[PDB]
Design a protein around this ligand. Structure first.
Ligand SMILES: Nc1ncnc2c1ncn2[C@@H]1O[C@H](COP(=O)(O)CP(=O)(O)O)[C@@H](O)[C@H]1O
Ligand SMILES: Nc1ncnc2c1ncn2[C@@H]1O[C@H](COP(=O)(O)CP(=O)(O)O)[C@@H](O)[C@H]1O
Ligand SMILES: CP(=O)(O)OC[C@H]1O[C@@H](n2cnc3c(N)ncnc32)[C@H](O)[C@@H]1O
Ligand SMILES: CP(=O)(O)OC[C@H]1O[C@@H](n2cnc3c(N)ncnc32)[C@H](O)[C@@H]1O
Lengths: 295, 295
């Protein structure tokens, strides 16, 4: 049958996914010996079971990566039938090529590591570059989070919107959101110009990851300065490190909308859940049903 | 110790490169048996030599891919020291992810095939997606073509330029060319809107591949209709299949600028050579000098 294990990155999301699915989370202690080495106890036999491990490789990234790899090894040697990795947030996704000399392509190395450890398949959400799906030779399902952010805004009954991409590489994303809301797009062209008509419109800034918030807050204020009626901001993954919160709270962003792909105070925010989406992906993968239906 | 072989895709480019490097192309004939199967005769012993093969996997793509793989196999079994692949145009680079269900990720399979056949390293030019560099675990150098197209436009003394991206996924590229030309950018948003000020400006349309020319010609005419003084168009790889030439010749494109990464009658065009760029790269790879010196 189906066993779901949660590691340490996002226990809540895991529990939420297990409940939506209708099963109790797997019994296992994933602790740390006194020396910081990862210790793993899977307290119930799992021979012949299909295991799903839920882990975001978010802060601290290297610890979550290692306890994930170590867990995969434990399951492989314990005879799991399949070892399915559910990764709500894929750390290192941004290092997807040699942008400069002698740089590692970490997203690819992670992929090689996971396969070497023994992973059977991966279920990922809003990967920074969709080409990362090709970094694996094991099956990998890539879910989009935009439909979730889109539904929330549509329910706000907004009028006169313009979807804004905070930089050059986010235009495709901005376009997927514009499509769903039947709206135009404008882009921030920082060398900080604004390409597109944002005058008197409700601007929605969308990015995949919101990390330090420099570009996003900087872009918001400039949207307002240039005539936008109000600015909303959203992303799938709330990394929010450094002075992010500080910056967001002090900006002109009316509301920051994020998902719980990463565990988290912000004054004007709203966290949407990707629990239902992942749970449903899990069931379909497990009942061998079409996943394309989720798109 | 250095030997360069040309396969059938682009003999001219290969000879040009060898002339710059100063070697005579290696002795081998790649022909067809009466039934269509590749026959490969390597006329000289290459034991211990560093072999570089020059092949674009352009039309007919599957034939060029097979003769390349078969050549790699011949070299491997003939004891080449290294087998270095110079790919000016990487066919199948557009299938870099699962954009819709049950699709293959061909760019990745090609990479897996090349390594399986025995490739040591790859030198590629303007890959459709830079992440394709991470599809390999063998070393791969990714040369850029924009600087070549940029130099040629600066020599036009065009004023009031705007670089235009023909769609959402080409904005980063458009930006690298704008940076060069210290110019602004506009983008075509087809659901066919134009986001950006193109009124009375010389518009330069830039894409990586120009295949059927539907989007590009369609974008040109719309640029003109909306107030652009004149439109130029450029790309690195001239696939130009189908009714491309037909369409280009009949459009308002003042001049189509391409490179010779792919072998080619167009009325207003200009072909620039990537021969010098690839040749210097081969020399630096063989000598183990810095390749990043070239960027
Ligand atoms: N419209 C979509 N947007 C983006 N990619 C999608 C969409 N539809 C399907 N895909 C891709 O196809 C994958 C799932 O499809 P498959 O498992 O091949 C087929 P099945 O429909 O049998 O599950 C997803 O993980 C995603 O990568
Ligand atoms: N400015 C840059 N733009 C794009 N790619 C670059 C840049 N700098 C270096 N690279 C990457 O680094 C590769 C070449 O440098 P490396 O082999 O890492 C180091 P070396 O300079 O020692 O050769 C290129 O093929 C390219 O992928
Ligand atoms: C705008 P992009 O092209 O999507 O961003 C990729 C760049 O960000 C850098 N990057 C990688 N990991 C990072 C991280 N965790 N924080 C900040 N930037 C990162 C990479 O070196 C790469 O040059
Ligand atoms: C510009 P893009 O968003 O990178 O385009 C990717 C899509 O173009 C298509 N594509 C793949 N191979 C191609 C080919 N040789 N001819 C035309 N389009 C191709 C596929 O439908 C793929 O999902």
């Amino acid at each position: 049958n189906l066993k779901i294990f949660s590691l340490n990155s996002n226990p809540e999301l895991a529990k939420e996914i297990a409940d939506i699915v209708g099963v109790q989370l797997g019994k296992c202690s994933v602790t740390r010996f006194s020396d910081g080495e990862v210790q793993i106890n899977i307290e119930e036999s799992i021979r012949g079971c299909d295991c799903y491990i839920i882990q975001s490789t978010s802060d601290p990234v290297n610890e979550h990566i290692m306890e994930l790899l170590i867990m995969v090894d434990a399951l492989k040697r314990a005879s799991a039938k399949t070892i399915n990795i559910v990764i709500p947030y894929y750390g290192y996704a941004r290092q997807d090529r040699k942008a400069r000399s002698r740089e590692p392509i970490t997203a690819k190395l992670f992929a090689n590591l996971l396969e070497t450890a023994g992973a059977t398949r991966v279920i990922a959400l809003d990967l920074h570059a969709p080409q990362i799906q090709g970094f694996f030779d094991i099956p990998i399902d890539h879910l989009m989070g935009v439909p979730i952010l889109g539904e929330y805004f549509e329910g706000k009954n907004l009028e006169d919107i313009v979807i804004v991409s905070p930089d050059h590489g986010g235009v495709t994303r901005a376009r997927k959101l514009a499509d769903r809301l039947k709206a135009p797009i404008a882009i921030i062209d920082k060398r900080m110009n604004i390409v597109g008509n944002i005058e008197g419109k409700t601007a929605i800034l969308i990015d995949d990851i919101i990390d330090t918030a420099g570009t996003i807050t900087l872009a918001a204020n400039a949207l307002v300065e240039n005539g936008a009626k109000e600015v909303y901001a959203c992303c799938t993954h709330p990394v929010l490190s450094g002075p992010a919160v500080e910056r967001i709270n002090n900006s002109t962003i009316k509301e920051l909308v994020v998902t719980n792909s990463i565990k988290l105070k912000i004054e004007r925010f709203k966290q949407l859940s990707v629990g239902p989406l992942l749970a449903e992906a899990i069931i379909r993968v497990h009942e061998q049903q079409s996943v394309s239906y989720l798109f």
